[PDB]
Amino acid sequence: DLNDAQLKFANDVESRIQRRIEAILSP
Amino acid sequence: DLNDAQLKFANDVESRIQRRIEAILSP
Amino acid sequence: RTLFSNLSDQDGGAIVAQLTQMNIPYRFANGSGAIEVPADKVHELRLRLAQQGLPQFSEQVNYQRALEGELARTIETLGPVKSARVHLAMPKPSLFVREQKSPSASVTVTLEPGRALDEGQISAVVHLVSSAVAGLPPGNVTLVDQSGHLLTQ
Amino acid sequence: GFELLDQEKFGISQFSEQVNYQRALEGELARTIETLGPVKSARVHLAMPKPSLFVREQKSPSASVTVTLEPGRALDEGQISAVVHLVSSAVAGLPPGNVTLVDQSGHLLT
Amino acid sequence: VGFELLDQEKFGISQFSEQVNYQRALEGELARTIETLGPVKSARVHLAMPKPSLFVREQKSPSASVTVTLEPGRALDEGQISAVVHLVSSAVAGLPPGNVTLVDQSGHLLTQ
Amino acid sequence: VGFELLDQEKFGISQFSEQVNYQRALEGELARTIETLGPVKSARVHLAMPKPSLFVREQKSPSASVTVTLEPGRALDEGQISAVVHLVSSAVAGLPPGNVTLVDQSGHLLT
Amino acid sequence: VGFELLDQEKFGISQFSEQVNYQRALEGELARTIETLGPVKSARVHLAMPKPSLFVREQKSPSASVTVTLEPGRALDEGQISAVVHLVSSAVAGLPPGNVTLVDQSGHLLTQS
Amino acid sequence: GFELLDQEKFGISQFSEQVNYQRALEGELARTIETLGPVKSARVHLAMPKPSLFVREQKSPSASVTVTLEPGRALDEGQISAVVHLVSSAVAGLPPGNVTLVDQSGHLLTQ
Amino acid sequence: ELLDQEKFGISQFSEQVNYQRALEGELARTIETLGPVKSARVHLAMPKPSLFVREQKSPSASVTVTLEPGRALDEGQISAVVHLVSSAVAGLPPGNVTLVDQSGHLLT
Amino acid sequence: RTLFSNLSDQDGGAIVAQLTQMNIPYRFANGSGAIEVPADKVHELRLRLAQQGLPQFSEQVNYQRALEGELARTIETLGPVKSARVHLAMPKPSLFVREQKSPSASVTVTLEPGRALDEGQISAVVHLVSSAVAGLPPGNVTLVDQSGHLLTQ
Amino acid sequence: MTPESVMMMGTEAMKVALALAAPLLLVALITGLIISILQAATQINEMTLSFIPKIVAVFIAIIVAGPWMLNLLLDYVRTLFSNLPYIIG
Amino acid sequence: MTPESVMMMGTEAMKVALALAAPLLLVALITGLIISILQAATQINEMTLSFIPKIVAVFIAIIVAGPWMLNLLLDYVRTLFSNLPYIIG
Amino acid sequence: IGFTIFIPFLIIDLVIASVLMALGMMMVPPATIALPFKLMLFVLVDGWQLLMGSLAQSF
Amino acid sequence: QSWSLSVQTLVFITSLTFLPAILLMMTSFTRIIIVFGLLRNALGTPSAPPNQVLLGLALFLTFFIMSPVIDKIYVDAYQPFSEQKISMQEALDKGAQPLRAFMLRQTREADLALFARLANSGPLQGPEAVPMRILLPAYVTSELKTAFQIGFTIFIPFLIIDLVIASVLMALGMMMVPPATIALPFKLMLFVLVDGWQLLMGSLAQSF
């Protein structure tokens, strides 16, 4: 229940950090 | 009841850690 | 070619209604519970309908393999999908008497560079696969991409 | 349900009224449950708790839901859930944990 | 039997009658759903819903007896036995499962 | 449907009946507006309103279950899930959004 | 509906009925004016008016849900959204704007989360 | 119109009498607002809160005014001010700041 | 004359709503009679008493005038209208009388 | 020449009513949802009606450019306007799935020496531009003069 | 409680009252009307002769139906006093 | 107070009473008159004929019009109590 | 205050007596039947709460 | 902070003085007494059960109904005070809470709002902080209203009996036969047959 919401929150944070890194490492 | 929910929570956490490892170890 | 066989009357009717709406010619096989449709449209239509929620070892294996292959082919008609592999894992008639088993499916897709599946397409794949296998709940369908990213929540 | 409700019947008794209300709710709930794709027919039984005598303790109501599925249309865990939520909400103070969902073969889905 | 039974009632209906009729109707619907179950050919449900008594200290938790007739050789699963228990218990306000007895057409107790 | 019913001339009615009829009518109109949202083909709303007291004894809060049938492939946006929540919550005096459940025709909880 | 709805009033009208009818009416007129707004093709207003409570920790507030259908491509401006909010809030005794939800025909929330 | 009140029955209760008074006021106010050069039609909605009791410092009413202007007839700041004054005065204890004025395009003319 | 329309007794509140209307009508009438004024519209807000606290709120008035095409109202006029309206309403504090023209200019 | 095309019946009717009132000849294109009007009056009428609140890349670009050009031309019919430039900036089909985008317009006007746009003219420009572009709210139209002074509040 | 609940309670009350009275009132009316019709047809001008049979009829009703009117009323009263702690509010 | 501040209040109160009691008395009188005329036409000699039609007519009128009279009386009493603090002056 | 508090109960008494006697049952005591209706009127109006409100607002 | 012994006994005796007021305005005595009086009036027997008998019955019923509250006061407040664990002030404060909860359970929110608005009390968050000076009159008013409701409802079967006997007598032409003389024995029979006394006391207890 709440644990799944916390896990999805962690997944979104990790994905956004990944995308931010990729954005500058791409050019 | 609650034990099964806890076990599924553990399984999802383990699977996501496994996938994160595989993602970088693949390229 | 056969779009679907072995349909309930309800599903059949729904499928016919949708085909008519889309102005697609169709021929419901007499008492075959099957609907042969334009051969070149079969896969596209299966997917589209899935989006709307519609509807020996060797043989089994073969069957399973054939089914896997067909499902893969259908999934590959999706624009963003370069290639698809489907693995069906229905445990052999539960040997254990007390314990209860259930079929599952793993779908791996290779996407075109720079392309992604949207939520609708993902749902269509999950439905397509679940509907094709008796007793396979949508929840037992795992969809992953070439990088191993889980697409199904 | 609501048909049983407006049947041009002169007032009988509060108890009769309460029984009619219970039946109508059961009917509509079964209706929506069937309207769910995999479900061919549904049957809902409600047990509203009876207020006891010299005590203020509160009993929680209970529900039993039997579903008949379309040939091979197994319910998703999310499907097992959404049914729970709907039935619980439709009954004032129904604790989900008191909703039992069963299939046409007698498998407990909840 | 059936909820119909209650639909057709005469003007003179004592509360006692109203209750007994409610009990009958509940029994009927429960048997109905139980038969709807694949392996079950016919069901018979008997409810003992004790009337509240201040003459007594404790009102015995309600009890139920369920007799099922199975289809030729259609043995009920342990899970089937349970689901029957759950349904009958829920349908009766404050019915403790442990007070539901399930029996087959041969007199074998399927519950405990 | 809902509001039309409430009117049906009738005299043999009790407060209880008056309330139940009000509940039905509200359910009907809410389902109506929900269907009138592009992706939604039909809606079904069930309200659980707790019978109130005029005394000082436990307030509690009502609950709602919303089932939507979508047009072939018309998935609802996170925003679509939200706006539905807001509308249903507002239409019920003191309905805490968190007590609104939204489900599709396949049994997926959009909540 | 609305003001016309309260015309053929049978003598048998419980206060409860009188209130519900007043609510239904207000909803109708508000939807009417909202549709009269250029970009709006049809409006639907739902009011949740809960008679009061003395305890603050157990007091909520009147709430409104407004669904608008726009003319093909007629997006509502920020100022429009603001004006819809103001009108609906004013029409309901003690309606705190922040309890007005405005949604379009596609399910986009036009007001605040 | 004030007419609505004149043509009425005798079975009407107090609630009805009040609602009718509110409607009549809404009508006359809209009327005068339209009778202002730049205004082609007006629509006034009053929210007059009922008796207090369960409340403490009581509360005050609110108004929403929608105007349709003549082609290009923009309302001046002083006009907006005069509309505010009129509507506020016509409602017992209406604090101007609770009067909202909006045009046919949804622009808030007041604040 | 609206007051005297051969109407069977209704209710005190009805009597009150009427009296308010009649006063509004006569005031508008006299205001129009004035040279520069073509038509007048008077709205009265008589205050509602409170519940348990003694608070005499003061009534308020809004006056809309349509002037003779072009002609305006002098300041003394902006004063005499105020006086008349204030006097006609028991306990009306002039400062609660708003006078507006057909263009929406506040004259008071 | 075409005054407006692709009008709702409601907008069409309103536009026809206004043309009749102004005694302007008009011809509603049969089933074209368009209203051809005197060629020499097209721009003036568009503006006047706007005051009253009425109503591939290369192609898009071209289209966009064409639309920009037309809007500019229409705005230039205003007395105080010497020249106008319109820039439309509708983001390419939102690539990001979750984030939501919306079209905007920037209008730059060169005014005749000593002349200014009044509030009505400003509102007409904003409406004209917003109505021409699907999904462009009035609030997303910025109007500036040659000196960079923001005219739209 | 709401006025509507009071109306429903009074409704079942006067329904029980009518059910009690009708077994007696109907037979009294029938006997009186029959005797009066016979009297008018036979021109036997005397009103008081209609009174004697009626009592017997009424008494007959009681001895034929006294139990029922005794029982039904109780089945109401025992309910009403048992609904006392649930009508307040 | 004043004779008027009292006569007007009494007139309003007895207007309320007349409105409350008009339907029952009207239906009672109409039913009694109809039964009496029917009796005289057939020359039936009896005095107790009209009572049962009277009672059923009054009972049915109460059932039909109860909500209306009760609501009217409740509203009148509510406004009387609300206006009571201003009656003294 | 008292003589106008008396008014609604007199109204109920007179209405019940008139209905009872016009119907024919003139031997019944009207007050006996009227008392429950007086209690009903007092409880459905919220007589106690409104009476306290009026008494407080009399000052 | 603990009161000296002489002050303690002064407080105790002064509080014992206020005993009938506490019984009438804080317990369930008033509602039972009002219902009993209305019932006695309803049977047509204005003086059949002597006032002392009904008062004793109401006292015993009140004691039985308030036994849980008294037990809570003893366990939570009085027992530590008697073992010198807590002072008299805090013991009284702790003993107020169960009685306050019981009185709040049987009060109407409208009367509480009326007395709060009348006393110009500031906004109160939840039922936790409501002064006793506010709760007591509201509880008394709610008890009066509930007692009148119960009495009016009880008045119904005897009204049915009176009406049916009056109609039966009238349809027989018996114009000058009063119905009270015939109705009183049948009222007694009706109340006896339904086991009226124990049923009414059980109903009064169940409503609390």
DSSP-assigned letters across all residues of M3-59: HHHSHHHHHHHHHHHHHHHHHT--SS-HHHHHHHHHHHHHHHTTHHHHHHHHHHHT-
Cα–Cα distances (Å) from A15 to A12, A20, C149, N136, in that order, read 5, 9, 11, 61
Does chain J reach chain I with at least 3 CB pairs under 8 Å?
Answer: no
Radius of gyration of chain D (CA): 16
Q: What is the dihedral of CA I73, I75, I78, I84, to 10 degrees?
A: -110
Of K3, K6, K40, which is closest to L43 when you measure between CB atoms? K40
Rounded Cα distance, M51 and M29, in Å? 29
Give yes or no for H14 touching L (CB within 8 A).
Answer: yes
Q: D65: which strand partners?
A: D44, D101
Distances (CA, A) of D66 to D37, D87, E37, E70, E79: 15, 12, 9, 18, 14
Which among G71, G99, G97 has a CA at the least distance from the CA of G86? G97
Three-state secondary structure call for residue G81: helix
Under 8 Å CB-to-CB from C39, ≥6 apart: which residues? C1
Q: Is F8 exposed, middle or buried (0-12, 13-18, 19+ CB in 10 A)?
A: exposed
Q: Give dist(CA I9, CA I5) in Å, integer.
A: 11
Contact indicator for G48, F27 with CB cutoff of 8 Å: no
Residue K25 touches chain D, beta carbons under 8 Å: no
Place of tokens 């109460």: L62
* Under 8 Å between Cβ of F82 and G105: no
What is the Cα–Cα distance from H40 to D31, expressed in whole angstroms?
Answer: 52
Q: Which of N191, N203, N193 is nearest to N42 (CA)?
A: N191
Nearest CA of chain E to the CA of K76: how many Å?
A: 8
CB contacts of L71 in chain H (<8 Å) are 13
Residue N128 DSSP class: T
Closest CA to N100 of N88, N90, N111, N92: N92
Contact (Cβ atoms closer than 8 angstroms) between residue E16 and residue N164: no
Cβ-contact F7, G75 below 8 angstroms? no
Are E15 and K78 a contacting pair at CB < 8 A? yes
Dihedral, CA atoms, I52, I54, I59, I60, nearest 10 degrees? -80
- Measured at the CA of D64, the angle between CA D62 and CA D67, to 5 degrees, comes to 155
Show the DSSP H helices in C22-89 as ranges. 42-51, 57-76
Q: How far is E90 from chain D (nearest CA, A)?
A: 5
Q: Looking at beta carbons, which residues of chain G come within 8 Å of K2?
A: 14, 16
Q: How was this structure determined?
A: cryo-EM
User: Is chain K in touch with chain J: ≥3 Cβ pairs within 8 A?
Assistant: no
CA distance C146 to C108: 7
Site from D52, D54, D56 to mutate, N interface, most N CB atoms within 10 angstroms? D54
Which residues of chain M make contact with L88, given a CB cutoff of 8 A?
A: 1, 58
Q: Which residues of K61-84 are buried (b: 16+ CB within 10 A; e: fewer)?
A: beeeeeeebeebbebbbbbbbeeb
- Side-by-side strand order, sheet with E63-70: E40-48, E63-70, E100-103
Query: Do H and L touch, counting CB pairs below 8 Å (3 needed)?
Result: yes
Q: DSSP H helical segments within J28-118, as ranges?
A: 42-51, 57-76
Chains F and K touch (3+ CB pairs under 8 A): yes
Tokens found for residue E7: 């639909």
CA distance linking residue C105 with residue C137, whole number of Å: 9
Place of tokens 């009263």: K77
Work out the minimum CA distance from G77 to partner chain J, whole angstroms: 5
Please count the structural domains in chain L: 1
What residues contact M47, with CB distance under 8 A and at least 6 apart?
A: L81, M41
Angstrom distance (rounded) from CA D68 to CA D105? 9
M4 shares contact with chain I (CB less than 8 Å): no
Pairing of strands C34-36, C27-29: antiparallel
Domain extent, residue L76, equals 1-89
Q: How far is residue E54 from each of residues D54, E16, E19, N199, measured CA to CA in Å?
A: 9, 17, 19, 11
Cβ atoms within 10 Å, residue M52: 18
D11 in contact with K, Cβ within 8 Å: yes
List chains adjacent to chain M, taking adjacency as at least 3 C-beta pairs closer than 8 Å. Answer: I, K, L, N
Question: Sheet of C105-111: strands edge to edge?
Answer: C81-88, C105-111, C141-145
| DSSP β-ladder status, E40-48 and D99-102 | unpaired
Smallest CA–CA distance, residue M7 to chain N, in Å, is: 20
For the beta sheet containing F63-70, the strands, ordered from the edge strand earlier in sequence to the opposite edge, are: F40-48, F63-70, F100-103
In a 3-state reduction of DSSP, which class is residue N120? Answer: coil
- From chain N, the residues in CB contact with K85 under 8 A are 203-204, 206-207
Tokens 């071209």 belong to which residue? J62
Q: Are the beta carbons of H76 and H83 closer than 8 angstroms?
A: no
CA distance N114 to chain H (A): 6
Could H11 and L79 be called an inter-chain contact, meaning their C-beta atoms sit closer than 8 Å? Answer: no
**Cα pseudo-dihedral J108, J113, J119, J124, rounded to 10:** -50
d(CA N186, CA N144): 30
Measure I10 CA to nearest chain L CA, in Å.
9
* E-strand stretches of E24-83: 40-48, 63-70
Say if L19 is an interface residue toward chain G (CB within 8 Å): no
How many angstroms separate the CA of residue K33 from the nearest CA in chain G?
38
Task: Tell me which residue in N105, N110, N112 faces F57 most closely, judged by beta carbons.
Answer: N105
Place of tokens 């702790």: N94
Say how far apart CA F83 and CA N141 lie, in whole Å.
Answer: 45
- Flag whether residue I8 sits within 8 Å of chain N, measured between CB atoms: no
Round to whole Å and give the CA distance between M18 and L29. Answer: 12
**Nearby residues of F84 by Cβ (< 8 Å), 6 or more positions away:** F34, F37, F66, F68, F76, F100, F102, F110, G107
Judge: N167–M29 Cβ closer than 8 Å, yes or no.
no
At residue C85, the 3 state secondary structure works out as: strand
Query: What are chain G's partners, defined as 3 or more CB pairs within 8 angstroms?
Result: F, H, J, K, L, N
The helix-helix angle for I12-33 and H14-34 (nearest 10°) equals: 20
J105 residue type, one letter: A
Alpha helix (H) residue ranges in N18-131 = 19-26, 29-42, 51-73, 79-82, 88-105, 109-118
Residue E12 has its nearest CB partner, among K72, K78, K79, at K72
Q: Which of K19, K71, K75 shows the shortest C-beta gap to E15?
A: K75
Q: How far is L11 from chain K (nearest CA, A)?
A: 26
Buried/exposed E60-97: b ≥16 CB within 10 Å, e otherwise: eebbbbbbbebeeeeebeebbebbbbbbbbbbbbbbee
For residue E97, cis peptide bond before it (omega within 30 degrees of 0): no
**Which residue in C117, C52, C43, C48 sits closest to C74, CA to CA?**
C43
Nearby residues of N37 by Cβ (< 8 Å), 6 or more positions away: N54
Rounded CA-CA distance F12/F18 in Å is: 11
N contact residues 87-126, partner H, Cβ 8 Å cutoff: 109-110, 113-114, 116-117, 122-123
Q: Which of F80, F103, F106, F111 to substitute to test the interface with C, most C CBs within 10 Å?
A: F106
* Chains touching H by CB (3 or more pairs below 8 Å): G, I, J, L, N
